[model samples]
Target: QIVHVRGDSETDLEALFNAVMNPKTANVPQTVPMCLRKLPASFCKPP
Candidate 1:
C-alpha cells in the first residue's frame, strides 16, 4: 500500500516519503498528488 505527502515540490515530496518510509535503503519510492496552493500540507503512511 502507498500514500501521499505534501512538500515543497514533487522532487522534495518523493525524497521526504522515501526518507521516512525507507530511511536505510530509500528504495521503492512512493507516489503523491501534486501540491495545490488551496490545499493544506500533510503526510500519510500505509496500513
Candidate 2:
C-alpha cells in the first residue's frame, strides 16, 4: 500500500504515485527517515 500527503506544493501526488510505481525510481533516497513509523497498522495496507 501507499500513503501520500495532500496539499504539499513541493510534491505532486500523481507524480509521486507514478514515480513510486516506476522501477527506475525504486532506489531513490525518499524513504530514508521512516517517519511514518507512528501510523496505525490499519491506516495503510501492506505493499
lDDT winner:
1
lDDT against the true structure, each candidate: 0.63, 0.60
Whole-model alpha-carbon lDDT for candidate 2 = 0.60
Candidate 2 lDDT by residue in tens digits, 1-47 = 89775686456655666566884864434663344777667656765
How high a TM-score does candidate 1 get? 0.31
Model 1 stretches astray by more than 4 angstroms: 1-8, 27-47
**Model 1, residue 17: displacement in angstroms?**
1.0
Question: How many clashes (backbone atoms < 3 Å, residues ≥3 apart in a chain or on different chains) does model 2 have?
Answer: 2
- Please write out the lDDT profile of model 1 over residues 1-47, one tens digit for every residue: 79666565787767777778777877545556456334545633334
